[PDB]
Amino acid sequence: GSSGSSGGNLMLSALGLRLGDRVLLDGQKTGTLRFCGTTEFASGQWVGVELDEPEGKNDGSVGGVRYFICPPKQGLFASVSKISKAVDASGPSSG
């Protein structure tokens, strides 16, 4: 079906990514995208990513705001600027 609109699909849309897909955290770790847009506890632009490996800090829940229900410590929030598009690393290259 391909759906899921909550509010804040202007950032990812401009970058070229969607929800559900995975990304490269710090060019090392890997997580699954879930949230994308603004935040309540903070300001600016942020995104919710779920840590694949058995690691994390928050359970995708901050105060009175819910982003996703993940196992014991399996959710980390960070700025899109500090994230890279994982999967498929074959294409444009020069140096």
Number of structural domains, the chain?
1
Domain CATH number, residue 69: 2.30.30.190
Q: How was this structure determined?
A: NMR
Q: Which 3-state string (H, E, C) describes the chain?
A: CCCCCCCCCCHHHHHCCCCCCEEEECCCEEEEEEEEECCCCCCCCEEEEEECCCCCCECCEECCEECCCCCCCCEEEECHHHEEECCCCCCCCCC
- Domain assignment of residue 21, given as a range: 1-95
Asked if residue 74 lies in contact with residue 68, where contact means CB atoms within 8 angstroms, the answer is no
For residue 63, the number of C-alpha atoms closer than 13 Å in the C-beta half-sphere is 5
